[PDB]
Every structure is written in structure tokens, then in C-alpha cells.
From Swiss-Prot, chain A:
Function, in words: Acts in a DNA repair pathway for removal of UV-induced DNA damage that is distinct from classical nucleotide excision repair and in repair of ionizing radiation damage. Functions in homologous recombination repair of DNA double strand breaks and in recovery of stalled replication forks.
Family assignment from sequence similarity: Belongs to the NSE4 family.
Organism superkingdom: Eukaryota
Upper taxonomic lineage: Eukaryota, Fungi, Dikarya, Ascomycota, Saccharomycotina
The organism of origin for this protein: Saccharomyces cerevisiae (strain ATCC 204508 / S288c) (Baker's yeast)
This protein's encoding gene: NSE4
Subunit-level organization: Component of the Smc5-Smc6 complex which consists of KRE29, MMS21, NSE1, NSE3, NSE4, NSE5, SMC5 and SMC6. Interacts with NSE3.
Protein name: Non-structural maintenance of chromosome element 4
From Swiss-Prot, chain B:
GO biological process: chromatin looping; DNA repair; double-strand break repair via homologous recombination; regulation of telomere maintenance
Record flagged with keyword Nucleus: yes
Entry-linked Gene3D superfamilies: MAGE homology domain, winged helix WH1 motif, MAGE homology domain, winged helix WH2 motif
Subcellular compartments: Nucleus; Cytoplasm
Species whose genome carries this gene: Saccharomyces cerevisiae (strain ATCC 204508 / S288c)
InterPro entries: MAGE, MAGE_WH1, MAGE_WH2, MHD_dom
Subunit composition and interactions: Component of the Smc5-Smc6 complex which consists of KRE29, MMS21, NSE1, NSE3, NSE4, NSE5, SMC5 and SMC6. Interacts with NSE4. Interacts with NSE1.
Annotated S-S bridges: none
Name of the protein described by the UniProt record: Non-structural maintenance of chromosome element 3
Pfam families noted in UniProt: MAGE
Additional information: Present with 2540 molecules/cell in log phase SD medium.
One GO cellular component term noted in the UniProt record for this chain: chromosome, telomeric region
UniProtKB/Swiss-Prot annotation, chain C:
GO aspect biological process, one term: regulation of telomere maintenance
PANTHER family linked: NON-SMC ELEMENT 1-RELATED, NON-STRUCTURAL MAINTENANCE OF CHROMOSOMES ELEMENT 1 HOMOLOG
Subcellular location field: Nucleus
Protein name: Non-structural maintenance of chromosomes element 1
Gene this chain is encoded by: NSE1
Species in which this protein is naturally found: Saccharomyces cerevisiae (strain ATCC 204508 / S288c) (Baker's yeast)
Gene Ontology cellular component annotations, sorted alphabetically: chromosome, telomeric region; nucleus; Smc5-Smc6 complex
Pfam families: SMC_Nse1, zf-RING-like
Residue ranges covered by zinc fingers (RING-type): 254-313
Amino acid sequence: AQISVRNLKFDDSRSMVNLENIVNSLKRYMLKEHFKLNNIAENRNDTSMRHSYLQQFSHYNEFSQFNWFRIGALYNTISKNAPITDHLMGPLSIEKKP
Amino acid sequence: DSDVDLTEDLAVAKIVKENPVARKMVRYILSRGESQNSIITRNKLQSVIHEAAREENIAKPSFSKMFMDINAILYNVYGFELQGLPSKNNMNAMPEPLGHRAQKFILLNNVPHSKNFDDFKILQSAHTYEELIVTGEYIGDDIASGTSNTLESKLSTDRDLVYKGVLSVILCIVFFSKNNILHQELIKFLETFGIPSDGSKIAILNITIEDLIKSLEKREYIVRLEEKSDTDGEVISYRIGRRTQAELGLESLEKLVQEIMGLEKEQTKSLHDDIIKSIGDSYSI
Amino acid sequence: PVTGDATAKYLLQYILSARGICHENALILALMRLETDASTLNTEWSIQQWVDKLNDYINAINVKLNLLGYKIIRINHGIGRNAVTLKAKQNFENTAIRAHNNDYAVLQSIVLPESNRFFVYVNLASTEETKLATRFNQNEIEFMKWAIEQFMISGETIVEGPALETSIIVKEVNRILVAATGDSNLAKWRKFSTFTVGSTNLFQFQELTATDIEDLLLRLCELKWFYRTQEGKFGIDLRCIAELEEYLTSMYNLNTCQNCHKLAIQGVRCGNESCREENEETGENSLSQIWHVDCFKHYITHVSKNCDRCGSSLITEGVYVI
């Protein structure tokens, strides 16, 4: 059972979403990319038909527009079980105490 | 049942009181494991244990007992646990975490993630992004104010947030690329996000792409494969480090990928096995 | 630790994931947002009951961490009342759904405007022989020490012109003054006390270059240590004084507020010339007689409206401190 699962490879135009579909769906977080400023909504195209809505995502044309903060919250909050802390400075607090 | 919590607090208080060096060791671990957000080695643990015992002149406690006490106290107050890390040579040659004999460790909070509170987390983190860099600007001396985080906000730094987002997208690219991607190919895909590939420092992080990848490797998120070859040159491919394997679980990755594409929970079927098929042998399990 | 200790874990994680400083209204919102799963609906609860439960949880966490060498101190901000409540367009909880400044409330409709105290995460071990490693190397630690030196040194001034910058503190002070009495006369005393003066003076530092100093200070502000006012001047944030309450009060003699166990850096500092005793060389409330905005409002409103420092009039009072 597990032998077949592990042996199978990826990047062969797999049914629902491939690597390109995965990355463009990740780019789908356009709540600020153009929705907020340009006010232009995605052009809706109305198993393989599910990825027809992701072709237009390849028009990033720049970096700063995309919302990196949101994904930065997805990670370190949802997954990774992040034990993040403040990391307060110690050397400033230490006293010589001669 | 209700008194279980209180008796556990009393027990951990007795343990830490009887083991004063445990407090110092927990402080040092919680500090060093985050100063660089890197892995901690068994040799370093042994050295710090001996140094603390000699300084406090108390009999050197057993390593297993110290490890158990640290894990218990962290679970009680911080919820953190020092889960074991499989040896890096296992892949290059359910597994219970050999904490008593694992070579390396890393802090990890064991509190189970809820279903929708993380939604509030991400909403608070991302709400202000529209005004942090509105019109392509940025906070700092370049503007007359620096209180864009208000008195306080969940955005935290906005320097580590972008770093974590880049890490997540890099892992997503690598995980589903048959857990093997060439360095040049990785740069090519990353260029689709607008990151300068000419060597110029990126805007938010202020770090070059090559330096960013070097830091990522130094933090053990991804391990470089220096497959030197005369015909193909010094081709380098990136694998998933053991840190991510013991840090990004299969269920956590499934939830992440599901909520990136925003598919309804009803159609979660055929996804758990699909993700396992796509990842392949990225995990030593 | 079936369900009860999970709430404590989540509250600690939320308070400690905000770089150690976060807003009490945010803590209450998070506590509701968490308990909504503990006991189903979680609707038969009052705001005062929520605050009491949050205080009990914080006390439990504080007693737990005290033996571990950590504490969660509650420190009142220099600003108070609706001035801190406004934040950025009051509390966050257009063409896109992202604009929800006044939506997605925890209940159908609930507001928590009252807000006066901040929660901070610090450690009480002043020596701290264990936690020496830090992302900041000795050079920027020395830079931090020198900067804080200048921030507290700049608090003493001889005279300032009648140029009232429209800051968020001065407006609240004027609001309190008019609330006490709507005279609207020339009671706005001209003298300015500034503990937050960024005027390229820091760039005069020697060891580090201008670009490195700029980057380091930007990172420090990003870590919620030094805050930049609208005019472009630098100032230490609430967390900075919260962590260094003993260090600032020990290595210098900065006057304490009306509270006998708390420190103040912004508000009103009458001073005049009848300072207590003589100290060494400085006066103007060198040793005591300083008040926060909320403390100032409490003291003026209640009995003894006139300052107790040998007696003074409200006209000579109101020495704005920034």
C-alpha cells in the first residue's frame, strides 16, 4: 500500500493542482495586490476545470504589491507550532555590581 | 479531575525548587534556541549542564532527569517541548522521539491548534499591511512617524513576518517539486514573486537572496546538496532539513495547503493522500 | 491540563507573541475568542466578569513564572482614557472585505472603549548571568546605553518658545485642562520638557556609521523599544521603561510619580523653582511631584487641585512634558 504511495512522483500534470497551480493559488492572496488600491477584481472565467481560474494570477509585475504579511501569519501561527518569544535584551540589564 | 491542574503546578514547583539549576537551564535554552532560531546540539547541552553544576556546586543531575524536568516545566508554563530530531544521516544512509538520546533538539509548543482562532491571528497580522506600505512606501526615518504599529499590534516586526512568508513559500515550492529543486530553477520560480534576482538587496528584509538562502540553510530549514559534476558544473539542489521535518507535520502541512487555496472543508477528501503522494519521501517516517 | 490549562497556554502565547507588549482590550478579545470553544456559546458573561477572569488568569501565570525568573507586569501608559482607545481608527474589531475596522465583533455587537493599562513581559533577574547571548552584539548594546543616556539627559530644559506642536499627548493634556475648567485662557504654559528628542543628535555617535546607526535604530523601533512621534523625534516606548524600571531608577535618580512604586517619563512636570531639597545640581521636580495623564486627571479632579509642592496655581502648572 504505502510502497505505491511513496513510489509515485509529482509534476506530471496531476489532476486537481500541480506545482504551477499550487504556486499561483498561493499568489491568489490578492486582497491587497490590486483589490485594495486598483479596485480591479479578478476576471472570473465562469476535475481539470477547477484550475481554469488560476491562469490570470501570473501578472504580478512587481513585488511590494503582494501581501507577504498574510502568508507570514499563515506560517508561524497555523503550522510549524511556533514557540516564538520576545527575546528581551540581557546585556543591557546586567549590572556589574562591584 | 479539577485538582489535576493544581497538583501538577504544585509538583512542577516542587521539582524546580529541588532543582534550582533547572530554572537557569530553561532560561538559557529558551534564549539560545531563539536568538538565532537555530538548532541546539547534545554537546552544547552537556557542556552547559556541567558548567551550571560546577558553578552552583550541586551534584550533576542525570541528563535524562534534567531533560524530563525541562520538558515538564516548559509544558506546564510555556507549553514548549524539546522534541527529538532524527539524525541527518538517516536519509543519507511511527518513530518515537528519542528525547533521552536524541542528538539535537528544538523548542516546540505542543498545545493543539484550534480550528478558527488562527483565523483571528492571521486577520490581525494582515489587516494593517494595507497601510504599512500604502502606495509602495515603508515605515522608518523615511517618513515623519514610526507608530504604524499603533501602541501595539499583532504584526510584530514586519521583518520576521516577511522572512517567515518567504520560508513558507520556499518550502511549498520545494515540497511539491518532487522534494528536489535546483538552485537556478528555484531562483527562476522565485523570480515570479518579484524578488530581485540580480543580487540587489530585497526591500523589506534588506538581505540579498543568496544571503537569505544561506541563512535558511544555517537554520537547518533546508539542506544544500553539493552535487559537484564536471559536465553539469557545480549544480546545487535543496532538500528539506530535518528541522522542518520535525517542525512542519503532515497534518499541519495539509491544513496549510488547504487554507492557502481556500477550498471548502467539505471537499477535504482525496487531499490527505494527494499531499502524501506529492511530498514523497521528504520525511524520515 | 484538559481544557483549563490550554486557555492559560494560549493567553501566555498571545501576550508573548506581540514582542512582549499588547493591549488589554486585545487580551480581553483574545480571551473571549478562545473561551468561545471551551464552554460552547459563552454568552452569559459580563465585561467586568471578563476583566476579573483575565486578571485571575494573569495572576496565575505571574505566580507560575515568578519562580522561573519571569513576570507579566501591568504598567499604565503615559496616555490614558479615550486617547489610548482611539489607536488607529478606534479598534479594528471599502472595495474589498479587508476593510472591517468596525465589523467582525466577537459578539453580535460589543465595545470595550475603556483602556488604561498595558501588559508587559519582562524578567526580574537584574544580574541575569544566564541570558547574555542576544541578536544584538556588544556594539549596539553600547549604542543602546548611550542612546538611553541621551534620552534621559534631554529631559532637562531651560526654556522653549510658544510653538505648540500638535502631538497626541498635548491634545489630551489640553482636553483634561478644559474638562477641569473651560476657561480656554492662556493657561497653556510655554515651557516644554522633552525626554524624546531625535534631532540628528544620535547620528553623532562615533563607533557606528550613519547607515549602520539608521538600520539599527529602525530595527529597534520595529522591535517596539523606541517609538517615533509624528514630528520625527525618537522616544523610548512603554516596554523599554517597563523592563528597566529598576535600572533607570537605580543608575539615575529620575523622579517617581505620585505612585510610590511606579516610574513616569511623560505627562506634566510643573517644577518651577521650588524643587524638593536641592538634589545635586538639577531641580524642576528632580526628586518627585510628577504625574501621568491619567494620574494628572485624577489629582486635579479630586481634592487638592493645586499642586502640593509648596503650593502653586493651575496657571503656572500644566508644564507640558513630551
